[PDB]
């Protein structure tokens, strides 16, 4: 195909077209970016003296371990302690362990800050050292600090203990232990609450995110976060919903929740750290208000919506409110934010279009109070586009597609036939997730992805060549889910997957990468793909240096030659780059094969004519200079 290049742009690319989508999905917050290493940290939100209470913690010898609600709880906001009680007549090492999610990577490079919360609930005359650590899942001590303690310190107490591992753990089977001296301690009862275990974070982050995970969504270049939420916004009940206030302030008034993929939150990803993330990042928000139903299937009648729109007004106060005018804007402030933080757009509810009898009213209430308090700030709409018919007229829509890879490159022309009446698209979850249009949501067996391929990932980068063409009114895109964690999935297929020590990279992610890494901000018309075929092309130039991006994705079985004529440019560069992702049509990136299908970086000769042969399965950028 001969593709004609239009020097004149025929539209400004919007700055956020590509970004991330993110909730608590497969461990993708605790057990994921954030960098906390204890699950169940704090016994939040299970039934004392039960099993499920104990989830990852594991006796040392002959400890008796429970959990109870405690007449004296650390705080109102974490009202179970662990009990820790040694026998009469106890020797050698007793205590407990910590699984970790799946693992604590043990690296003699880090140093870990262990905390906890102790008492004694009944005054003794103990007198001992008090040992946390680091070991393998043999018994095997990697790093350990102690401090002394005693029985007569009956008021809660923290203990602060740096770890420095001795050696690198050669896989990630290692836990975190407390222990104290069994003959010692015979007898002695102490309660424990609000352990905490951090290896260095993202940017030396206090209460941060997890270095590996940060540093491959900046890779990325997003330009925003959209959170947070996605399903885990919405709860199975009112009562069970996301709440922005529950997590902001110390750890220990984090009261936590049950999210919506099967585990508890504890909440120390809370909205202060999203917001630090996206300045440490250059992201902009995105940020979901919850919007009067949740999963259960109850909506909220219309007379009890007042007291949930003032939480999103308080939500959206403590990003950008000033903090002389609320009291979540002062929260702010007394958290060391001061200055507000960006925020331009809000969305109203989680995929409203499962609640489309209740969202006309919600929507209708949420937005003219929440646009009557926040004139500057464009509210989206999740209820299909224009069906149910919304008052007000939705300024956005975010509109999502799980389908097939084949789906994709078919349906590149989505936004082609949309009106140009001032609404604008969010794309804010799509996924090629399935190769069987039967079942999209079924087995890896009858078809699911377990993991990105070259084929799911060129067939959205054909779609993403629409939305990049369609750019005058789609505005932000984001594929879903964002992280995995290997060892505890609900969905897949995700972008970026990891276990407790490595992250995997896959095609999709290299996709999104090279289409928002190689972004101008002029959208160059040129010739059409074809509408149904396999092969697509978007090109975009940035204005300050005449930088040309050439995004082809070929999403089909056969190889397609281009030529590009760019004779309308007075100049183009003689050599140009070629970025280039591709490999067997069902190649993915797995824990075993991380770097299986990697993109390869090479220069072509380039000019006002130039032809690349676009191999099969293929994403490549192509970049010259133009003038
Ligand atoms: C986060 O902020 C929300 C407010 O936006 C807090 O929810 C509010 O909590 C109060 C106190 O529990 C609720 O008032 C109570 O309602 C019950 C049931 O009708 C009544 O029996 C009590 O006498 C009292 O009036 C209020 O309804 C509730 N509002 C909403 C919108 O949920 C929430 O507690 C805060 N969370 C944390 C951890 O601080
Ligand atoms: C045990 O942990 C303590 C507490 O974190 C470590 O002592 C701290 O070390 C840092 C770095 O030198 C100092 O800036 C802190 O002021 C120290 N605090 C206290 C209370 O001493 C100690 O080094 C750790 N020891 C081991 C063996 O890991
Ligand atoms: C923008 O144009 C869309 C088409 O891209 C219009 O959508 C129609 O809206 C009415 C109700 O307002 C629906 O009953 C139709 O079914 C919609 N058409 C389609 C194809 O979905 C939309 O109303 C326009 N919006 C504005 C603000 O003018
Ligand atoms: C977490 O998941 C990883 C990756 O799936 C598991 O490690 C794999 O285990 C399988 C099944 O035993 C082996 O055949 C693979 O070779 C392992 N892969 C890698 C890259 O190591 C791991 O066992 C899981 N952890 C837990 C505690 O379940
Ligand atoms: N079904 C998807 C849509 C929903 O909002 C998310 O929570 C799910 C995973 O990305
Ligand atoms: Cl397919």
């Avoid at 906001?77 to 009469?88: C, R």
């Avoid at 399903?231 to 984090?254: I, K, M």
């Amino acid at each position: 195909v001969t593709v004609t290049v239009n020097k004149n742009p025929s539209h400004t690319v919007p700055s956020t077209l590509y970004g991330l989508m993110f909730e608590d999905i497969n461990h993708s917050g605790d057990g994921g970016l954030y960098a906390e290493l204890l699950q169940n940290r704090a016994f939040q939100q299970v039934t004392p003296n039960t099993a499920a209470a104990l989830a990852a913690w594991h006796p040392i010898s002959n400890a008796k371990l429970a959990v109870i609600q405690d007449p004296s709880p650390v705080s109102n906001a974490l009202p179970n302690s662990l009990q820790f009680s040694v026998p009469s007549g106890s020797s050698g090492r007793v205590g407990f362990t910590n699984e970790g999610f799946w693992g604590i990577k043990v690296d003699s490079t880090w140093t870990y800050k262990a905390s906890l919360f102790f008492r004694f609930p009944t005054s003794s005359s103990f007198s001992g050292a008090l040992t946390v650590g680091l070991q393998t899942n043999a018994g095997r001590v990697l790093a350990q600090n102690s401090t002394q303690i005693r029985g007569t310190t009956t008021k809660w107490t923290q203990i602060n203990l740096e770890l420095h591992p001795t050696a690198s753990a050669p896989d990630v089977s290692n836990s975190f232990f407390v222990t104290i001296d069994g003959a010692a301690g015979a007898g002695q009862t102490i309660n424990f609450a609000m352990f905490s275990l951090f290896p260095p974070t993202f940017k030396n982050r206090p209460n941060g995110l997890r270095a590996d995970i940060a540093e491959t969504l900046a890779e990325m270049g997003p330009s925003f976060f959209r959170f947070p939420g996605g399903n885990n916004l919405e709860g199975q009940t009112t009562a069970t919903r996301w709440q922005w206030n529950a997590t902001v302030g110390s750890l220990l008034d984090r009261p936590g929740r049950v999210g919506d993929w099967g585990y508890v939150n504890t909440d120390g990803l809370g909205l202060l750290e999203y917001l630090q993330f996206f300045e440490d990042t250059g992201m902009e928000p995105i940020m979901a208000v919850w919007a009067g139903y949740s999963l259960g299937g109850t909506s909220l009648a219309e007379n009890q919506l007042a007291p949930y729109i003032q939480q999103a007004i308080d939500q959206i106060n403590f990003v950008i409110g000033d903090p002389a005018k609320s009291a979540p804007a002062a929260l702010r402030a007394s958290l060391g934010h001061p200055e507000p933080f960006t925020l331009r757009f809000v969305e109203v509810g989680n995929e409203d279009f499962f609640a489309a009898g209740s969202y006309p009213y919600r929507w209708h209430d949420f937005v003219t109070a929440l646009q009557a308090q926040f004139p500057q700030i464009r509210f989206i709409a999740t209820t299909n586009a224009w069906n149910p018919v919304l008052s007000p007229v939705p300024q956005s829509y975010d509109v999502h597609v799980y389908q097939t890879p084949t789906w994709f490159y078919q349906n590149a022309f989505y936004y082609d036939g949309f009106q140009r009446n001032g609404t604008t698209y969010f794309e804010g979850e799509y996924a090629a997730i399935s190769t069987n249009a039967n079942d999209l949501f079924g087995t890896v067996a009858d078809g699911r992805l377990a993991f990105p391929t070259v084929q799911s990932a060129t067939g959205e980068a054909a779609f993403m060549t629409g939305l990049e063409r369609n750019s005058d009114i789609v505005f932000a895109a984001s594929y879903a889910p964002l992280l995995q964690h290997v060892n505890s999935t609900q969905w897949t297929p995700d972008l970026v997957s990891y276990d407790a020590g490595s992250v995997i990279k896959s095609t999709s992610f290299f996709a999104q990468k090279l289409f928002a890494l190689n972004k101008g901000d002029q959208y160059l018309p040129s010739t059409l793909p074809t509408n149904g075929g396999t092969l697509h092309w978007s090109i975009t130039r940035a204005s300050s240096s005449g930088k040309t991006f050439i995004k082809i994705a070929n999403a089909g079985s056969s190889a397609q030659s281009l030529t590009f004529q760019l004779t309308q440019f007075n100049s183009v560069s003689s050599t140009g780059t070629l970025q280039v992702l591709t490999g067997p049509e069902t190649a993915s990136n797995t824990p075993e094969a991380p770097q299986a299908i990697v993109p390869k970086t090479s220069t072509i000769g380039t000019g006002k004519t130039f032809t690349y042969n676009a191999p099969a399965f293929s994403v490549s950028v192509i970049t010259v200079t133009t003038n």
